[PDB]
Write an enzyme that holds these catalytic residues in place. Structure first.
Site, PDB file in Angstrom:
ATOM      1  NE  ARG A  48      -3.085 -13.523   8.710  1.00 38.62           N
ATOM      2  CZ  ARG A  48      -1.973 -13.529   9.444  1.00 38.62           C
ATOM      3  NH1 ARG A  48      -1.384 -12.389   9.800  1.00 38.62           N
ATOM      4  NH2 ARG A  48      -1.444 -14.684   9.829  1.00 38.62           N
ATOM      5  N   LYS A  53      -7.638  -8.923   9.841  1.00 33.91           N
ATOM      6  CA  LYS A  53      -7.368  -9.639  11.086  1.00 33.91           C
ATOM      7  C   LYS A  53      -5.881  -9.656  11.364  1.00 33.91           C
TER       8      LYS A  53
END
Ligand code: CL
Ligand code: MG
Lengths: 172, 167
Positions: free
Chosen positions: A122, A155
């Protein structure tokens, strides 16, 4: 427990093809023919190419339809020269009663869960670049060369300093 | 249920992403990654992305280093190959930490076809002559009014024809 849902198709025609970056362009061309002719490719264990007509959707012209497809198929393989030589394609066609339907099995694979999985998957953006957090930098710095990217977004996690992994150090 | 997993105090993880057939290109690429994973003694983790773990299941004190070496080879392998249009936009992330890991068993369904026609079409292709379309009598009889076919011979028991084209 039942693991098969299948029906008898009395009227069906089956095709197998095989060869005895270029090969992928060819198979991509075959894939396109299947869809154009409204036929069904069947996923098979092997390198062989299986196409089926009259099943799952019956049609009274199942053999002719598979026949037209096979001709277009050989035609496609003829046009495409490779070393400059034509593709050595074998094609087989048969017709008769079959059974067909869905079978249940199980796929076994490795998986991983944890903060490390999140961080690795991420991190935002980069191309050809290998990005790593501090905890990895500290483990790699003595035997590899890295250059600081800076603070970026991971994220679901937050902002994180990262480094680009450039290459290995030649042993001293 | 459907998972056999263990706690691993330290492991290293790699995530690679790439941001109609092309389907086959990405498959050939992942096939090259697969071979690399085996070369390095690592393990693949299982749609449009690729993940690798080091230290699982086999312990190794150099797990991050081994993942790093793999990762540089990964990028080089991607750099060589090119898609049939453009170079391949490969971005890689690595991390290390404690994880839980093991085997997942997921129900998968396949659409299959069985029967003598499958067996016979398979025989027809394997014994085919290159460049031709081989078919038995039962096919011959259904096609003969509309297509031209020339007899080839008998195969071991069974007669076959060559499909030449439409009339
Ligand atoms: Cl027909
Ligand atoms: Mg385990």
């Amino acid at each position: 427990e039942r693991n098969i849902i299948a029906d008898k198709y009395d009227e069906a025609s089956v095709l197998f093809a095989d060869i005895v970056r270029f090969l992928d362009r060819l198979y991509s061309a075959f894939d396109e023919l299947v869809d154009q002719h409204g036929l069904e490719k069947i996923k098979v264990s092997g390198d062989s190419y299986m196409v089926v007509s009259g099943v799952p959707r019956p049609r009274p012209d199942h053999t002719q339809a598979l026949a037209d497809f096979a001709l277009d198929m050989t035609n496609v393989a003829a046009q495409l020269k490779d070393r400059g030589n034509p593709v050595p394609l074998r094609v087989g066609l048969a017709t008769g009663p079959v059974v067909a339907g869905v079978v249940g099995s199980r796929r076994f694979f490795y998986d991983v869960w944890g903060d490390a999985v999140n961080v690795a998957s991420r991190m935002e953006s980069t191309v050809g670049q290998i990005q790593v957090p501090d905890e990895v930098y500290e483990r790699l710095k003595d035997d590899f060369v890295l250059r600081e990217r800076g603070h970026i977004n991971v994220k679901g996690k937050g902002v994180m300093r990262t480094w680009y992994l450039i290459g290995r150090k030649v042993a001293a």
